[PDB]
Amino acid sequence: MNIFTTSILLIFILLLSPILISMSNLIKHINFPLYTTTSIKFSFIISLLPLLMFFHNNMEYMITTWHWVTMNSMELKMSFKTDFFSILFTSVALFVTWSIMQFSSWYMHSDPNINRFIKYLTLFLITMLILTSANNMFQLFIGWEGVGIMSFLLIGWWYGRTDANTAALQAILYNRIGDIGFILAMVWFSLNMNSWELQQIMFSNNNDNLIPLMGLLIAATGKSAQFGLHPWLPSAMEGPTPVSALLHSSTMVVAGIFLLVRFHPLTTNNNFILTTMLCLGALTTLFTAICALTQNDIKKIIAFSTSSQLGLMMVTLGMNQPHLAFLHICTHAFFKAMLFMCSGSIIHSLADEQDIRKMGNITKIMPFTSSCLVIGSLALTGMPFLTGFYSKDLIIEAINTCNTNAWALLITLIATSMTAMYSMRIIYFVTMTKPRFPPLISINENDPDLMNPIKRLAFGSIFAGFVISYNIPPTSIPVLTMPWFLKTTALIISVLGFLIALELNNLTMKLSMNKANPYSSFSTLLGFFPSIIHRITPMKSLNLSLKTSLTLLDLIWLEKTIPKSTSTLHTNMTTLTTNQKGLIKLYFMSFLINIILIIILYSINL
Amino acid sequence: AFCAPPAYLTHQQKVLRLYKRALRHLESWCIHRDKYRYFACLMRARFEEHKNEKDMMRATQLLREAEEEFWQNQHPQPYIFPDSPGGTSFERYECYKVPEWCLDYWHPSEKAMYPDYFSKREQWKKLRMESWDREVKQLQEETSPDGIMTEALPPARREGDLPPLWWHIVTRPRERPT
Amino acid sequence: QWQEDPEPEDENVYAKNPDFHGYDSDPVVDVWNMRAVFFFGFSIVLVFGTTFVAYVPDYRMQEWARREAERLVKYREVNGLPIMESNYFDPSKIQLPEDD
Amino acid sequence: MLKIILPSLMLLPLTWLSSPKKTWTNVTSYSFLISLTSLTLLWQTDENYKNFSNMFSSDPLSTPLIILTAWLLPLMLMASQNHLKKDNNVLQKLYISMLISLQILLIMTFSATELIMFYILFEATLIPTLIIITRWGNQTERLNAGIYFLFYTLIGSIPLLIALILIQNHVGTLNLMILSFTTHTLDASWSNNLLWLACMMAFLIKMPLYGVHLWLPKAHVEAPIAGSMILAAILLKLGSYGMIRISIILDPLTKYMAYPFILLSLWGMIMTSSICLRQTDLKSLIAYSSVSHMALVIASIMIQTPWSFMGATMLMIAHGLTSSLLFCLANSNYERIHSRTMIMARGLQMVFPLMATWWLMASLANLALPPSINLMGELFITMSLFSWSNFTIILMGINIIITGMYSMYMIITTQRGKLTNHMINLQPSHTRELTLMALHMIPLILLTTSPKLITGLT
Amino acid sequence: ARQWQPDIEWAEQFSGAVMYPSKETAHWKPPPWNDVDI
Amino acid sequence: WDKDVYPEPPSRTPAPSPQTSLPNPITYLTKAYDLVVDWPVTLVREFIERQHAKNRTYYYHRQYRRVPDITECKEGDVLCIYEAEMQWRRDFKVDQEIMNIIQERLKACQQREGENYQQNCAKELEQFTKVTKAYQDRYLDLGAYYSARKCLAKQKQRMLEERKAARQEA
Amino acid sequence: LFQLLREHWVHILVPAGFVFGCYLDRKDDEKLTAFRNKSMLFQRELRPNEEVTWK
Numbered sequence A: 001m002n003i004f005t006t007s008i009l010l011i012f013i014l015l016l017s018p019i020l021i022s023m024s025n026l027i028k029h030i031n032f033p034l035y036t037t038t039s040i041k042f043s044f045i046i047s048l049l050p051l052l053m054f055f056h057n058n059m060e061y062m063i064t065t066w067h068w069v070t071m072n073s074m075e076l077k078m079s080f081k082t083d084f085f086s087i088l089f090t091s092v093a094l095f096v097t098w099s100i101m102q103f104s105s106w107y108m109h110s111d112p113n114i115n116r117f118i119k120y121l122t123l124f125l126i127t128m129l130i131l132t133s134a135n136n137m138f139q140l141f142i143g144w145e146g147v148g149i150m151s152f153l154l155i156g157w158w159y160g161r162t163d164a165n166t167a168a169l170q171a172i173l174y175n176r177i178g179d180i181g182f183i184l185a186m187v188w189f190s191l192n193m194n195s196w197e198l199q200q201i202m203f204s205n206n207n208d209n210l211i212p213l214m215g216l217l218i219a220a221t222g223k224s225a226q227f228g229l230h231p232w233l234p235s236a237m238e239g240p241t242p243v244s245a246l247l248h249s250s251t252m253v254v255a256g257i258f259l260l261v262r263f264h265p266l267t268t269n270n271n272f273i274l275t276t277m278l279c280l281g282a283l284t285t286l287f288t289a290i291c292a293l294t295q296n297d298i299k300k301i302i303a304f305s306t307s308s309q310l311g312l313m314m315v316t317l318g319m320n321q322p323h324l325a326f327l328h329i330c331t332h333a334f335f336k337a338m339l340f341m342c343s344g345s346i347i348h349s350l351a352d353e354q355d356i357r358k359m360g361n362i363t364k365i366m367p368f369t370s371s372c373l374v375i376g377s378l379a380l381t382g383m384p385f386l387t388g389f390y391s392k393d394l395i396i397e398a399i400n401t402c403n404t405n406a407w408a409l410l411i412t413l414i415a416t417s418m419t420a421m422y423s424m425r426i427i428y429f430v431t432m433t434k435p436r437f438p439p440l441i442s443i444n445e446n447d448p449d450l451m452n453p454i455k456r457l458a459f460g461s462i463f464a465g466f467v468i469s470y471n472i473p474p475t476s477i478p479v480l481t482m483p484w485f486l487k488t489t490a491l492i493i494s495v496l497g498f499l500i501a502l503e504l505n506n507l508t509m510k511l512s513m514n515k516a517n518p519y520s521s522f523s524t525l526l527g528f529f530p531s532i533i534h535r536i537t538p539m540k541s542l543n544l545s546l547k548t549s550l551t552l553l554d555l556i557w558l559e560k561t562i563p564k565s566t567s568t569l570h571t572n573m574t575t576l577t578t579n580q581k582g583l584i585k586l587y588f589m590s591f592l593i594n595i596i597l598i599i600i601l602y603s604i605n606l
Numbered sequence B: 001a002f003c004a005p006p007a008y009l010t011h012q013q014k015v016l017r018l019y020k021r022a023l024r025h026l027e028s029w030c031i032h033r034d035k036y037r038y039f040a041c042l043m044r045a046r047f048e049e050h051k052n053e054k055d056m057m058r059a060t061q062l063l064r065e066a067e068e069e070f071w072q073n074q075h076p077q078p079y080i081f082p083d084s085p086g087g088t089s090f091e092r093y094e095c096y097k098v099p100e101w102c103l104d105y106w107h108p109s110e111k112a113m114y115p116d117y118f119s120k121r122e123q124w125k126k127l128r129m130e131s132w133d134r135e136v137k138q139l140q141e142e143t144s145p146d147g148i149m150t151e152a153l154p155p156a157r158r159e160g161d162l163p164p165l166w167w168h169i170v171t172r173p174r175e176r177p178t
Numbered sequence C: 001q002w003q004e005d006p007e008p009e010d011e012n013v014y015a016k017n018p019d020f021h022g023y024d025s026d027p028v029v030d031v032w033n034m035r036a037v038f039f040f041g042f043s044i045v046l047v048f049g050t051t052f053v054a055y056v057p058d059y060r061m062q063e064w065a066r067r068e069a070e071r072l073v074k075y076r077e078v079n080g081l082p083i084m085e086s087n088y089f090d091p092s093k094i095q096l097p098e099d100d
Numbered sequence D: 001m002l003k004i005i006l007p008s009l010m011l012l013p014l015t016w017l018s019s020p021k022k023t024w025t026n027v028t029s030y031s032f033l034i035s036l037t038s039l040t041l042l043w044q045t046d047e048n049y050k051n052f053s054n055m056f057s058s059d060p061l062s063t064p065l066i067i068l069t070a071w072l073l074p075l076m077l078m079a080s081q082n083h084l085k086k087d088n089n090v091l092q093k094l095y096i097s098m099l100i101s102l103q104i105l106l107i108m109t110f111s112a113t114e115l116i117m118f119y120i121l122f123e124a125t126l127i128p129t130l131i132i133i134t135r136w137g138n139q140t141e142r143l144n145a146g147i148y149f150l151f152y153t154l155i156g157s158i159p160l161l162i163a164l165i166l167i168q169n170h171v172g173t174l175n176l177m178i179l180s181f182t183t184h185t186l187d188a189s190w191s192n193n194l195l196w197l198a199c200m201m202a203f204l205i206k207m208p209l210y211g212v213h214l215w216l217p218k219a220h221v222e223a224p225i226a227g228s229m230i231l232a233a234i235l236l237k238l239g240s241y242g243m244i245r246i247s248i249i250l251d252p253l254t255k256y257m258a259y260p261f262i263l264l265s266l267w268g269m270i271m272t273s274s275i276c277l278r279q280t281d282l283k284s285l286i287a288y289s290s291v292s293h294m295a296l297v298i299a300s301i302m303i304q305t306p307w308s309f310m311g312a313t314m315l316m317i318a319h320g321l322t323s324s325l326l327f328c329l330a331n332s333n334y335e336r337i338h339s340r341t342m343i344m345a346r347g348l349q350m351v352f353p354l355m356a357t358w359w360l361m362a363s364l365a366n367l368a369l370p371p372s373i374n375l376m377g378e379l380f381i382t383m384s385l386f387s388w389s390n391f392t393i394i395l396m397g398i399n400i401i402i403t404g405m406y407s408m409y410m411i412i413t414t415q416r417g418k419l420t421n422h423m424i425n426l427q428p429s430h431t432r433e434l435t436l437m438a439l440h441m442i443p444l445i446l447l448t449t450s451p452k453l454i455t456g457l458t
Numbered sequence E: 001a002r003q004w005q006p007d008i009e010w011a012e013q014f015s016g017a018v019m020y021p022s023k024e025t026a027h028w029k030p031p032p033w034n035d036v037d038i
Numbered sequence F: 001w002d003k004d005v006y007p008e009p010p011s012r013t014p015a016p017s018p019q020t021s022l023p024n025p026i027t028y029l030t031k032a033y034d035l036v037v038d039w040p041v042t043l044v045r046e047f048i049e050r051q052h053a054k055n056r057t058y059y060y061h062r063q064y065r066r067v068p069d070i071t072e073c074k075e076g077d078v079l080c081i082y083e084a085e086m087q088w089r090r091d092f093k094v095d096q097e098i099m100n101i102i103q104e105r106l107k108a109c110q111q112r113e114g115e116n117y118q119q120n121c122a123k124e125l126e127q128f129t130k131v132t133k134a135y136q137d138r139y140l141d142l143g144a145y146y147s148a149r150k151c152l153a154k155q156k157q158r159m160l161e162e163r164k165a166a167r168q169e170a
Numbered sequence G: 001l002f003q004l005l006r007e008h009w010v011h012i013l014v015p016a017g018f019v020f021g022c023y024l025d026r027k028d029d030e031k032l033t034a035f036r037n038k039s040m041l042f043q044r045e046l047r048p049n050e051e052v053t054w055k
C-alpha cells in the first residue's frame, strides 16, 4: 500500500521543508514559528495514516530508499523500518513536538533569535525520527550522534552563560562514552555476522552476542542516564525550558531504551545482560528518585523524575518485557512533557523564578496550569484510569510476579512510593501553600499559544493510555493472576507515598527544627556523584596531559633524545676535529701517523 | 559590582556579612514564611547579644565559632536569586550584550536606516575624545602621593569635565538586551 | 639604537571601500576578483564538476557487477551449479607438489 | 596526465608575465579550471587502472588526491591574498609560483609510476615548502622549524634512496606496475627486517608517527596559512601514499615487523589527542589533532586489511579537507586577533555569526559525526583494528572520547562565552575568508553523498 | 605584525672565527677583513 | 527485476471481513489517495514513458570473454599475468555481488516472515553458509593486495590438507 | 587577437598548455600502440572499413 510507504517517506520530507526555507531568503518574508508549527501538525496527521494501517493488520515495511556505497560485501543503504516500535513512536513524538513548538513560540517570545531556535528543534526531530526508524545501524548511529550534537547546540542555547556551556560539554562527554559502546557493537556486527542491517543482525540469535549487546547496554546507559554517568540529564536543564520538554523530557532520553527494544530478539538469548540492566535500571530508579526528594529546583525535580521513570523502563527491558517497556515510553512522553511546560508556564509567568522555595499558591493564582500540573502529577503517580495506569502497573506487577533480585524488587516499589513523594513535593510547594513569590504579581497564561498546546497534551494525558493499550497488538502474555496484595501493590504504595509525604510537608509549617540534616545532603547535592567524580576525573585527566604526556614525554624527553641529541653529538664532534693549532709541525706529524697506519693496513692484510 | 573591593576586611563587615548569609541560609531551611520570620528574629538575637563585647579577642572568637557553626548548619541548596551568581539567569542574556564598539564597522547601508540613532552616537563619541585629555590629567594630577592606591577613581571636581574613565560604566551593554 | 621602522598599523580596509570583499584594496580589482572567484570557484566547478562526476558511468564496474551476478545467479541456480563454488582456480589446473 | 600538469606549469608563466594588479585573479581563476580538467581522471568505468603513459599513471588511490592537490592551489592562493598583500610585487609573484610548483610537483608525485620518480619529486616538495615556511614565516622560530622539517624528512629520505636502488638491483625495475605483478617476497632475515624499516621509515616520518612527529607541531605553528594548509592537506598524505605503493613489495615482513609502529601509533593517538586538550595555541591544537588522526592512518596502512586501506583513503582525503578548513579559520582569527592564543578571542559568534557556523561544521567533521566521510573512515579503521585484536577498541576508544572533547573545546572557548572586552575591534568578515571556507566544506558535503570515489584501491 | 626579520643579536653569532666556539676556541677572533695582519 | 535472481514469494491476503457498522477510516482515505495522489501522478508518469519510447535507445552488457589464467601463465611474463590478474580481480567482484545478493535476499526473507524467521527463512540461511563457507575458502585470509597468485596459494596450501588429511586417514 | 597588455597574450597561456597537453597525451598513445588490437580480452577482428580498433 503505497499510501503506507509514501506516508513514512513523506513525514521526513515535510519536516525537512522548514530547514531549507531558512537556507533560502524566504523565511524573512513568512512567519517561521507559525509555519513550522503547522507542518509538524500536518506531519502528525500523516503519521496517523500508517498507524491505522498497522492496526488493521500487523505488517512491517522495510523501505530501502537510497543506496550509498556498495563497499564490496557490506553494501550500505538508507533504510527506514516501519515496525510497531517505529510508527507508534513517530506519532507520539510529533504530537509532543507539535505541543512544544506552540509552547516555544510563547516561551521564547522576545528572544532575538526565535527562528534559529525553532530550526534546531525540528532538526532534532529529524535526527530523533531517523534514530527511531533506522534499519541498518549506520543510520541508527547517524541518529544517535545526531541528537547528541544538536542537544549540545540546544542545551547551550544561551552560549554566553558558562553554566550552559559546561552542561553542553558534559552532555557530549557522557554521550561519547556511550558512542564507544555503539561503535563496539557496530564493529562486532561488522565482523562475525556481517551487515549493519537489523534484518540480518537478528540472525545472530544463536551466537554469543554478548560482546555486542554489552556494547549497546553501555550505549543505553550513557544515553538514558542510568546510574553510571547519570548526571548530565540533571545538567541538561540548563537548556531553555521548551528544549528541556521535547528532548530532555521525551525523545532524546528514550533513545537508549528504544535501541535495546530494537535489538531484543538478540537480548532474549543472553540471560547475563538482561539482569545486568535490570540491576542498574533498578539502582538508577531509586538513586535518582531519592535525589529528587530534596532538590529545590522545579525543573530539576521533573528531570530526576524523567530519569527515574526511564529507570523503571530499563527495569522492564531487564526483565525481558520489551513491548510494555515501549508502552511506557509513549505514555511517559505525554505526562513528563506536560509537567515541564507546566513549570515553563510557572517560571515564565513569575519573574523567571525556577525555585519551588519562592513559588507558592499557583492553584488559585493560575488554575489552568495547576489543573494541568496535578493531571500530570497523578499520571506520573499512576492514578487509576489515566495513561500511566494502563502501562505502569503492568510493569509493577510484572516485577512482583517474575523471578528477580530481591534487592531490585524492593527498591523498584519504594522508588514508586518516592515518585509519589516528590510528585507530592511539587504540588505542595509549587501549588498548595501560601504564596512566597516576589510581591508585584503579573501572571498571564491566557495566550492561546500557552493554553492550546497545554490543553491538547492534557487531553492526551487523560485519554492516551486508554487508546494505546486497546489498539496495540496483543503481546507479552501478561500474568493477571496475583495474590491481591501484589495485584494492588502499585496502587497502595503510591497512595501512602503521598500520604507519608503529605505528613512530612505538614511538619514543615510548624515553628520548629529549622534545620534538618538526615543524610538530607546525600540526597540534595545529587548523591555526591557530581561533587566527586566531576572534580577528580577532569582534574586527573588534564593534569596528566599538560604535566606528563605533553611537557614530559613531548617537548623534553622526545626532543632531548632524537632531535636535540643528534644536534649535540655533532656539535661536540666538530669542536674537537676543528680546534687546530694551525702550526705546521702538528699537522704534518699527523701525516706521519697516517703513513704509518696505511703502511700497516697493507702489511697486515698483505 | 560597582564599587571597588577594600583591601582588608574589618571586623564589622565580616560580622555584618554573616548576618546576610546566615539569615539567607535560614530561608532555605524555613521554606515557609511565618516559621522563617520567627526563626530569624531569633537569629538576630544571637547577633544582638555579643554586640557590645569590647574585648576584640573575644569578638573575633565569637565570629570564628559563628562561621563554623554556620558552615555545618548551612543548606546545600540555598535560595540564590536569579541574576545572582551560580543560580540561573546569571549569564543568560549575555549572548545578546554586544559591546557597542561594533556598530562602527556597519555598512553604510545598515547605518543608513536608523539615521537619528547614529546622529546622537556621533555626539557621544565627540564627548569621549573631547575630555580624554582633561580626564587622564585629572587622574594624574590627583594621583596618590604614596604607593597606597585603591581602585577607587575620582569624581569630576570641575564643570564640563566628565567624571573620568567613564566610557565603559556609561555605554555599558544594556543588561537585558531583549 | 639600530635604525628600524616603527610598527606599521594594519588598515581598516573597511573604512574606505566599505564594500571590501577581502581580495584587494582598490575597489574594481576586488569586485572583479570575486566576480571571477565565486564564478570559477562555485558556479562551474562545484556545479559542472558534480554534474560530470555524478554522470561517470558504472564507476569501477560496480554497476556492471550487479547484473553479471544476476545472470550468473540466474544461470547457476537454474542449472543447479553451486552459486559460489568453493575453489576458484580449478583443482585440475593446479599441479600440487606431489610428494609433500 | 599532462593537462593536469602542463597547464599547471603554464601557471608559472602567467604569475610572472601578468599585471601586478591582475596577477591574483588570473592565477586563481585558471587553477579552478585546472581542477576541472583534473576531474576527468575520475572517469574510471573499469577496473583496469589508467596508465596514461610510461612515467605517468593514476589509480584509484592517486586520483582522489591529484584532484585535492589541484583543488587546494586555488584555495591556497585565496587564503594568502591578505598577508602577502603587503609585499613588493615580486615577493608575491614568488609566493604564488611557489604554491603553483607544490601541486605541479605533488600532482606528479601522486601520479608517478616509478617509485624513485616518487623519491626525487617526493623530496623536492621540501624545497617549495621550506621557502614558504622560512621566508614568509611570521615568528622568530621558523628558521628552527625549517631546520626540523628538512632534517627529519632528509635523514629518513636517504635510507629510502638506498633501499629503492637496492630493490632495482634485486628485482630489476622500480616500476610500480611490474613490481606488483612480480614475485618480490622478502625472506624475514635480519637484513630484510632492516630493508622494510628503510622503505617505511621515510614515509612514516612525514606521516607524523608518535616517535618523530615533533617536526609537524613546530612547522605549522610559524608556517604561513598557505604552508600550513599544504602540510596538513597534501604534504603529510605524501607519506601515506608512499606506504600504500611501497608495501606491495616487502609483503611478508610487515605481518610481524609492524607491531612496533602499530602500538607506537595507537598509544600515540591517545597522547597526541590528549595534549590537544590543554594547548594554548589553536594552531598547535589543530596540528596535534592532525598527528592523532594521522596516527590512525599508519595503523591501517599496516594492519593491511581491505577495509583499513579503504578507511585510510577515506580519512586521508576527508581529514585533509577538514584540517585545512580548521587551519584556514584559525588564520582568520589570528589576523584580526594578532595572537595565536586560544584563551583570547572568546565569544566570536556574537560578532562573527557565520564564521562560527563554519567553525561548528569543521569541528563536527573533526570529531566523527556520522553522515560524514570522516566518520566512515574511522569506523572502518576501527573495525579492522578490532579484527587485528579485539582489545584495540580500548585505545581507539579513549581517542574517540578525547577527540570529542578537544574538537568542541575549540568551539566552546573560541566561538562561545562572553565576548572579549576590547581587543582591537574585530573587523567584519571578508567574503574571501568565508568562501575559502565554503570552498573547503561544500566539497566535504558533496563527497559524503557518494563516498565510492575516495574509497581506496582495496 | 612583521615577519620577524633577524635583529643584530641573531646576526652576532655568525661572527667569530668559528660558529660553535668552545673553550680556548673563543680565543680565536675573526680574521682581519682586509686579509692583512698588523 | 528478474523474479528469479531476486525472488519474491506469491502473496496470500486475507479477504476483507468487516464486522462493524462503523466506517473504516482507511478505505475512505485510499479512495482519495488514489484520485488526488495517484491519478495525478499516474498521468504524468505515462507521458514520461511515451516520451522515452519515441527515441528508444539501447545499452548492452559488454561480455568479457575468458582468457588465460595464472596457472596457464608463464612466470615473469608480466603481459600474460597482467591480463590474468585482471580476469581475477574482475571475478573478485562478480563473486562479491553474488554475496551481496544473498546478503539481500535474506534480509527480505526475515522482514517478510517475521516471528517465523526462525523457520520459514531457512532456505536462504542454509545458502548463506553454503556461499559464506566458500567465500571464506578463496578470498578471506588475503591482504589488501589481493592477487590471483595469492588465491592460487591460499587454495594450494589447503589442497595439501585435502591430500595430507586424506592420505593420513588412510 | 593577441590583444596586448595582458589582454590575450597572457590569458591564452594556460589554455594553450592544455591543448599542447592533449596533443602529447594523444601522441603517447601513438607510441604505445603495440598490442594495438593484439590483446586477448579485446582481440576482435577488424570490422569492414575501419582502420584500427582504438586510435
Ligand SMILES: CCCCCCCCCCCCCCCCCC(=O)OC[C@H](COP(=O)(O)OCCN)OC(=O)CCCCCCCCCCCCCCCCC
Pocket: A163, A166, A167, A169, A170, A173, A174, A177, A227, A228, A229, A235, A530, A533, A534, A535, A537, A538, A541, A542, D277, D401, D402, D405
Ligand atoms: C555504575 C556503577 C559504577 C559507578 C561509577 C562508575 C564511573 C562513573 C563515571 C565514569 C566516568 C564518567 C566521565 C567522567 C567525567 C564526567 C564529565 C565531567 O566531569 O565534566 C564536568 C565538568 C564540570 O562540570 P560539573 O562538575 O557538572 O559542574 C557544572 C556546573 N558547575 O565539566 C568539564 O568540562 C570537565 C572537563 C571536561 C574536559 C576534559 C575531561 C576529560 C576528557 C578525557 C577523559 C574523559 C573521562 C575519562 C575517560 C572515559 C571514562 C569512562
Ligand SMILES: CCCCCCCCCCCCCCCCCC(=O)OC[C@H](COP(=O)(O)OCCN)OC(=O)CCCCCCCCCCCCCCCCC
Pocket: A066, A067, A068, A069, A070, C045, C046, C049, C050, C053, C054, D035, D039, D042, D063, D064, D065, D067, D068, D071, D317, D361, D364, D365, D369, D371, D372, D443, D444, D445, D446, D447, D448, D449, D450, D451, D452, D453, D454
Ligand atoms: C574527488 C576526490 C576528492 C576531491 C576533493 C576536492 C574536489 C573539489 C572539486 C570537485 C568537487 C566536485 C567533485 C566531488 C563531489 C562529487 C559529488 C558526487 O559525486 O555526487 C554523486 C551523487 C550521485 O550519487 P551516487 O553515489 O552516484 O549514487 C549511489 C548509488 N549507490 O550525485 C548527487 O547526489 C549530487 C547531490 C548534490 C547535493 C548533495 C548534498 C547531500 C548532503 C548529504 C550529507 C548531509 C550531511 C553532511 C554532514 C557532513 C558533516 C561534516
